[PDB]
Paper text:
The mechanism involves a macromolecular complex composed of the small ribosomal subunit, the mRNA, a specialized methionylated initiator tRNA and initiation factors (IFs). In archaea, genomic analyses have shown that three IFs homologous to their eukaryotic counterparts, aIF1, aIF1A, and aIF2 are found. In the present study, we determine the cryo-EM structure of an archaeal IC (IC2, 30S:mRNA:aIF1A:aIF2:GTP:Met-tRNAiMet) from P. abyssi devoid of aIF1 at an overall resolution of 3.2 Å. In the absence of aIF1, the 30S head is no longer mobile and the initiator tRNA becomes stably bound to the P site.
Density subtractions of the head or the body parts of the 30S further improved map quality. 34 modifications have been modeled, 19 in the body and 15 in the 30S head. Here, the position of the C-terminal arginine uS9-R135 is further stabilized by hydrogen bonds between the carboxylate group and uS19-R124. We modeled the C-terminal tail of uS13 entering the major groove of the tRNA anticodon stem, with the guanidinium group of uS13-R145 facing the Hoogsteen edge of G30. On the same side of the tRNA molecule, just below uS13, is the uS19 C-terminal extremity. Finally, faint density for the three uS19 C-terminal residues (130–132) suggests their positioning at the edge between the P and A site codons, close to W60 of aIF1A.
Residue numbers in the entry:
A (entry chain O): 3 to 145
B (entry chain 6): 13 to 107
C (entry chain K): 2 to 135
D (entry chain L): 1 to 101
E (entry chain S): 2 to 67
F (entry chain Y): 1 to 50
G (entry chain X): 5 to 71
H (entry chain U): 2 to 150
The structure:
Amino acid sequence: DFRHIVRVAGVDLDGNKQLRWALTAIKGVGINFATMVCRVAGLDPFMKAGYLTDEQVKKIEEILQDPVAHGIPRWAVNRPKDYETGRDLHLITAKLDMAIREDIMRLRRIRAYRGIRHELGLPVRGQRTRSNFRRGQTVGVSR
Amino acid sequence: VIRVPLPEGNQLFGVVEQALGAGWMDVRCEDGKIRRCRIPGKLRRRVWIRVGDLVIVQPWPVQSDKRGDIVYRYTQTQVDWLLRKGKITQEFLTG
Amino acid sequence: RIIQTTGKRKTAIARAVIREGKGRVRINGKPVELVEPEIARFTILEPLILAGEEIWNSVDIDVKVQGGGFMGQAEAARIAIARALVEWTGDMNLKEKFIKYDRTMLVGDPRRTEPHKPNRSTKGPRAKRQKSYR
Amino acid sequence: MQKARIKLASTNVRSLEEVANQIKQIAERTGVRMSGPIPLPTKRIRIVTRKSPDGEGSATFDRWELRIHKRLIDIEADERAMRQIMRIRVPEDVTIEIELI
Amino acid sequence: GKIRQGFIKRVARELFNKYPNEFTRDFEHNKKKVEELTNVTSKKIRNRIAGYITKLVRMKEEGKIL
Amino acid sequence: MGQKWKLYIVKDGKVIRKNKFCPRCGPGVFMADHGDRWACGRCGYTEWKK
Amino acid sequence: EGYPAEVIEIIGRTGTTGDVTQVKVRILEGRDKGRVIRRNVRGPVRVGDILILRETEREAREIKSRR
Amino acid sequence: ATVYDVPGDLLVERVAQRLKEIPEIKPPEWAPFVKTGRHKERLPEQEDWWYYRVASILRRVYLDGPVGIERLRTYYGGRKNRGHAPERFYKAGGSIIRKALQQLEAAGFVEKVPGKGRVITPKGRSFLDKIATELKKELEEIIPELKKY
Amino acid sequence: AKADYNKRKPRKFGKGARRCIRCGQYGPIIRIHGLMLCRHCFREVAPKLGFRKYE
Amino acid sequence: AIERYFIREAVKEMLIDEFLEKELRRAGYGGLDIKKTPLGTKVIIFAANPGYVIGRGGRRIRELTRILERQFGLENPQIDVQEIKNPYLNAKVQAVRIAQALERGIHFRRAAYAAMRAIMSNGARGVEIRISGKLTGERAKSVRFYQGYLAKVGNPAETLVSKGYAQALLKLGVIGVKVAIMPPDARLPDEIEIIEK
Amino acid sequence: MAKPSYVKFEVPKELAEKALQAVEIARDTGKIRKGTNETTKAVERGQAKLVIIAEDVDPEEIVAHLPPLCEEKEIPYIYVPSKKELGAAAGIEVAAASVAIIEPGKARDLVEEIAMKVRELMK
Amino acid sequence: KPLSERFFIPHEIKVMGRWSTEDVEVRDPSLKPYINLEPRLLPHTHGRHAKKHFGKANVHIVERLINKIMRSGGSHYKVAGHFMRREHRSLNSKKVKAYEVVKEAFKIIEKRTGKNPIQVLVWAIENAAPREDTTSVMFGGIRYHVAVDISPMRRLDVALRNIALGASAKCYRTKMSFAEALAEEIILAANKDPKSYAYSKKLEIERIAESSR
Amino acid sequence: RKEFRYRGYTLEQLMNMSLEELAKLLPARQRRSLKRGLTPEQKKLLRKIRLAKKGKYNKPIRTHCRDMIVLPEMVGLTIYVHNGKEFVPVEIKPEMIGHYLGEFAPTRKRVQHGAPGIGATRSSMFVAVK
RNA sequence: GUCGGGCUCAUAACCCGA
RNA sequence: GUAAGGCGGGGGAGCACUACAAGGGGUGGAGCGUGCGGUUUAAUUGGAUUCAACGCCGGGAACCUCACCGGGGGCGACGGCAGGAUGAAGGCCAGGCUGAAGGUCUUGCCGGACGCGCCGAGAGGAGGUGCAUGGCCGCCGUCAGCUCGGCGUCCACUUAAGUGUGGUAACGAGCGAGACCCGCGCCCCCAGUUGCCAGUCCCUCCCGCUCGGGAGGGAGGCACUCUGGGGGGACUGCCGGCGAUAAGCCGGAGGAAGGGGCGGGCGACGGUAGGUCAGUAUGCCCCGAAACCCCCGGGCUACACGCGCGCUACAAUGGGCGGGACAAUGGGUGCCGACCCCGAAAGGGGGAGGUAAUCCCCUAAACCCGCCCUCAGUUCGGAUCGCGGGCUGCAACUCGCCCGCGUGAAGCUGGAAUCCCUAGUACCCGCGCGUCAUCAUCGCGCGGCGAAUACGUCCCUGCUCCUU
Ligand SMILES: [Mg+2]
Ligand SMILES: [Mg+2]
Ligand SMILES: [Mg+2]
Ligand SMILES: [Mg+2]
Ligand SMILES: [Mg+2]
Ligand SMILES: [Mg+2]
Ligand SMILES: [Mg+2]
Ligand SMILES: [Mg+2]
Ligand SMILES: [Zn+2]
């Protein structure tokens, strides 16, 4: 009954790892958050992912669609207090990066100071730029 | 605005064609007449001139041909400063 | 009758007390049979293990140690225990064996750290920065 | 009774022992008990400061220090002794404090 | 180098050829008889004068003084 | 330095000062006549002139 | 392999930077067994040591008058 | 026998198992989603991590007198991995310790000294010393040197 | 009034809230155990306060 | 605590003394000492000519106490003038006397020789004067005079030699003076005698 | 106190003397309130004792303030011949109008004579 | 891990309480008075020797082995390829850890071979000690590199350092640990096997020393 | 996706909220700054924006206070902000509320680099000073 | 041959990398 | 021209981990913290450039600091002039200009003598000059020199040393070295609170049920530790061998300690036109209604690039989770905050005791035991960015610090070159003070754990003496 590749919520994940570490392959889940959803779905976080039957994948995917309505606190979600509505949302692989893209386009529309630094590709959180952050290539005077 | 040795009185601009040695430098002036400049005593110690750098000089009206005298020098900060205002034209350096 | 002695090792003072008994020895309340870093348990056992299963089973010792660290307290306890065992019994064929083996079990160690000087001053007296010509 | 408690403190350690000994005398000449001068830990204050006015040269420092010595005395409350300890004429750099317990 | 100092010798001689029978070959006797015959107020300085006097009394009592 | 001290509503036969006093200080110090309020002059009052 | 020798006298410090020492050794088994020769050693040496050497006929070049 | 006669961690392991019978000790319902301090990085891995912390706090006021919360936070602190900067010590949180002491107090094992902290009652001394004796009785079967005392 | 534009502002924290008692400068001021002096004025008047340089 | 009391009363003396230097430069200020009795203190000022410090019938002293009570602490001050104990062993005074003789117009080699002669007459062991400024030229110089024994390095030359410094402003610039004296009862450690019978 | 181009009455010389010479002696002893537009208010309160109003002010608008107001107070006053002497009697060197004072010290006999003279004479 | 081995109580003065140095035998007459094999229950002397000339002669050999692995590796000389700069995760002043790895090495050596572990170590530190070398000599003006002889104390020091460094490379970024890489080095040296590091270094020293006689 | 909503509230809806029920919908910085009150200069600026909003003050609004927090009273009008030398027009739109006022007026000019000069490398230092 | 870094108080000569 | 002896790729002797030799750890290659040169700007304020410039000017700058850029507004003791009690200098309710302002103006009141519209002078100046000075400081150098009433100060040997002993046209001296001062390690006397608890005695509680063992209080005592005033102890003194038998040097006993006992303070006559006029003092030259004094907003925090000093790593000589162990220096009234309650955390509300051996900061980390990971760009590494919650402050966008969830860059051991260290030292690990309203990858100190090698040479890099 063992399976070598299981597919849960989009991406398919390994079958010879501990369930808590196979769920990290999803972009939008870390190790602190995967432990929570294994403890809420009610199954051990040390079992090998390949032993997941179908009902358990269904429960996991359900918990991934609204974590607050199942027991996860609301200080432990991906983005709390959504900008369009005051809900508490946790987003994953394909809809997470679209949110960040729109969050940067908003700052670029009004021409804020933090959206222009995104335009130019320069440091945004106030670092110093004389000695580090050197991504370009050398220049000379003469030899 | 700025403290630059622009033309003040009877000034000239020095762009040397060749150094023969012994204090004589020959400049390719827009005049056409080859001016053979010399050196005073105050600049032969603290500053240091070479070939190809625009400098300032003072001529003497004697024949208005072989004359000239440096009294101050130009930096690298100013060589391209004296171009945007159009005070001097660069094409006489390349033609 | 009872006796009491002293031992010191780099900011670690130890006070021991000996008397007639059954053979049990406690250090701060812990029996020496239960001390975890074995390299520290074998240090406080030599003065006893070198005197035999005979003198060991006629005394009760208890040491009060404070200061220093887990290895600077074991040697303080050892000095205290040897200095006490050499007085209770009062025989010198035992003081002989305590000096062929280790002379400091009975005279002590006078070494302390050295004040640091100013070039880094937070690394040591003689550690300095890194020179740089050019 | 009432075990008055005198507390001296000073920087010159020589100019302290003589006041302590005056009090020791005054107690001995009379009939009254006294707890000998109890030494409390010295309180040295220390200040490190760079030695040059500008910033050139290697950096070398100073270590200035000021030490302050303290004592403690208990004594029974007798007018024959209290009166005598009131004309004792402390020197200038000696600070004295009395308070009944 | 444990070189003897200049004023140690200069006094250790001056009070050995002035009282040439008041110093024996013993160290601890000299140390006392030195502290009372001079105004030395240090302690490392009377130890060294006592040592030099001992070395003088053991050389002049055996033979050739140099 | 010119001359300006007049128009106190003062005549001959009798005198009736035009601007009243400032209650804050005693008598003597007069009032202002801006046209909407009575301004002290050096005290502090905006009682909306009577 | 190798015949041993016993160090009985030191002569001083040779070496381009003061590292080797010249000594006088006495062989004690093999073809010679008793001849006294001179050799150079690298390291700290006492009297009474026992070196292990592999040639027994080299006779280190004499030192500059020991001084 | 007392708790001075045995190794501490084997005792804590044995005491935690007994603590699962007192119906007053039960983990708060925000326990599956927390870590124990700002100096840690990941959440506790064993499922009964509550019982170990409680049973370590009980043995902790037994042999350290009247003690309060802000001193049990310095014991349960540690070193931090704060990125590119050098390591540094920090205290621990408070709720995990406060709930533990309140639940122990409701069990009867500790109590409150007015203005000094918390002590252990005769009932708690009985509880710990009995288990310590039960542990030592089976630790003389392998080290026959603990027989003496 | 013309007496409102030569008058300072009363800071109470910052480098401009403490100045040397003897020189009058802002910056490197010792504030240990009360004393309030430049690091330059202390070093030249410490022997008269009673400090000594033992070690 | 207590150290804050011990070093709050050492700064008041320092400020009062440093003000009195400037104020009483002439007539030769020597030094002071405060005595704190109940209900008030007692200030003593060892000048060298009480005539200038007291005033005309004592009208300078009124101003002095008014300042010493308003601009400094000293809730109830009482001044009285004195005379220096030994003016020729107090280098901090000879520095000022040489400085004044300079800025009055005397050559810088008569001043120093006269001063050294007086100090070594009144019974000192040895003296050292060092005058360094723009004397005789436009480039600075420095000269040095000395007479007898004088320790320089070590603990005995930190407690036994008395030393002072003073400026002598002139028409061209300043000139620094530095004097140092060793009193006639010194006794270095090097000096031992044989207590004989 | 208007210009002499105002026929109020005649002016004698004795009161002039013993009232213009009444100021210096009262100046070295009291508190002086010079000028006109200053003590108009003090006499509005009525505190100034011996006011001394002259006849020199021109033009005739700011000139008659007290003669309309003398009829409501006690106004112990005189008339003054000219101005320079009034500036010299107290204060400064300008053309003065009414140098009124309070508390004439040592100068009360002249008060009792000529002040009550001018009181009983006219008002 | 078994409590009978976690709480260990010795009753006798043997080295580390487990093995006895009575029938070990130093065959080499040169390295006889420098290999110390006296009773010495515990091997830790708190560095009281490195103050007197020729002092480290009376220090038990097991302790010299323990002191010479409290290092990081090769920090200014490449050893078998690379540098081995291990900062902040080296056992530079941790003696407890070095003591444990030497104890575990000895427990593995006693099992694969079946002999007293110190007999094997004393065999190994004689096959790794070289007896010829090379240096320079200044004389009249020039130099030229020659052959010299090695004194026995230096032989012992070089042998021990070479065993330490040879064992300290087989455990670098490899699946093998350090307690067992320290046993695989000793077992291999005492067999005069080429795969060693300490034995090969003696061969390559003696060879290029003979080349220049 | 056509109207602007901040937390589910439209503009004219979040416009008549008070200053304490709104600050629950702002980030932590803005809430704390609104809770310690407006500084007197921001009070003089708000006193002048509420005139320009009702009927009066047809005259360009200028300010130095780069710390003002864009609030739903200021949506529509164009104010000028001092960037160190000039007053820069910053028209206020929804999606600006919450942000600081200086966040839309830059203070340093963009740097477009030239060519290294003498001393820029270790090969041009000692061959040029003579 | 070109840019960059090393060695020297600094330039030449010399060593290394792109 | 802005104040008319030393050296030599010569010879001897002697030294030093900022020299080598024998060793331990690294830097140089990747990312970031910070200082510098250079480019950019309205300004990105200045000084320092081999050792001896570059976490240096105690320089961790949000306002102030501040010297820089854009704007606004103030100040001439004192002499003598225009004018001035018919009222000089000066102050304000409301409203305009304004970033905001009785600063100016509209509007009318007030105060009672002076008077920058004028002339001379004067305060004040982080304005020039450190190449006009004083004071202070770094380097030759803690080297052995520099001189007085060419020699003496040279030669042989000796010393850390111009430190000593002999021979000497030399004999006597001074300052520097030494002596001197502060700590550390061993023993004794006097002291016993706020420090200490061993032996006796009362009282309560717990365990194998108590014969034994343990834990807290109060009665008592200075026994031990400690605190700090005074004393002792070590002198080449004793034994053996070199050297003359003298100066001295090697080895050993006894000793807590051994050959300046170990670690620090104190830097001669002079030079370096070395640094500082931007710590204070000061001559000359310049600004003097401005280069002086204040207030608002920007800047020193910009970023194709070359360099210095560091922090974190490239994994098993480890990462994570849960348990268990042991310090010292210092600081506290504008401040330290035990103890109870609220929160998941940062944090929030009450609040004893402390002006100090009395109460607080203050149950350190590396280390040990159990389980998961198994050589992989990973359960290594933690830059970079999104959303949300807090603290200090009059003010956090430029441009502060802290917390939770998410994202997951280069990096798989480093070319030529090059630095620091000789014993409780170097390496590894955390802590306290300074600066401080808030902010430590820094300076200065503290303890924890604890080695390898050599007791030597003048080969390289330097310095001191005699000679040529
Ligand atoms: Mg080159
Ligand atoms: Mg600023
Ligand atoms: Mg200079
Ligand atoms: Mg010299
Ligand atoms: Mg210069
Ligand atoms: Mg800066
Ligand atoms: Mg990780
Ligand atoms: Mg900010
Ligand atoms: Zn100052």
